[PDB]
């Protein structure tokens, strides 16, 4: 149940037509709804090093594709609704276009 794998999210087709003051605040919610259906639990936490990689070039100027690694961890607290939670952190790669989704080996 505790799985972790990497995805490429095409944010260009999510932030199309969105207002310029809301591109990166929409991108946060689109990454949350991405990780709400891949490994489909609620309570998706992003990383601050993911937030500052969304927000690298302002409100407008989110990158076209991001490379994430979503980890469905098990909740350490009591958590009396949805006892699993995702955790989304970026993968530092150059030119994140051209990669499929792969399952990283648990260690």
Partner RNA sequence: GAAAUUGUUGAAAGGGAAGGGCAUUUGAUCAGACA
Partner RNA sequence: CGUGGAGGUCAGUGACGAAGCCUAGACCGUAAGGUCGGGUCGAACGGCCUCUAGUGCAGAUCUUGGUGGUAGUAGCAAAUAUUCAAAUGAGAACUUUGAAGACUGAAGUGGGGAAAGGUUCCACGUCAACAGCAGUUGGACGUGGGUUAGUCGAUCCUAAGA
Binding site for RNA (CB under 7 A): 21, 24-25, 28, 45-52, 54-59
CB of 40 or CB of 58, closer to RNA: 58
For the bound state, the minimum distance from the C-beta of residue 32 to RNA, rounded and expressed in Å, comes to 7
Give CA–CA dist 81/84, Å, rounded.
Answer: 9
> For residues 15 and 50, which CB has a smaller minimum distance to RNA in the complex?
50
* Shortest distance (Å) from residue 105 CB to RNA: 25
| CA distances from residue 97 to 20, 46, 61, 86, 103 in whole angstroms, order as listed | 23, 21, 16, 23, 18
């Amino acid at each position: 149940d505790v799985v972790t794998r990497e995805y490429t999210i095409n944010l260009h087709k999510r932030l199309h037509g969105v207002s310029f003051k809301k591109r990166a605040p929409r991108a946060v919610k689109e990454i949350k709804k991405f990780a709400k259906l891949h490994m489909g639990t609620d309570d998706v936490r992003l990383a601050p090093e993911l937030n500052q990689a969304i927000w690298k070039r302002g409100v407008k100027g989110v990158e076209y594709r991001l490379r994430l690694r979503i980890s469905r961890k098990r909740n350490e607290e009591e958590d009396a609704k949805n006892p699993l939670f995702s955790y989304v952190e970026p993968v530092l790669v150059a030119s994140a276009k051209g990669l499929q989704t792969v399952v990283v080996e648990e260690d």
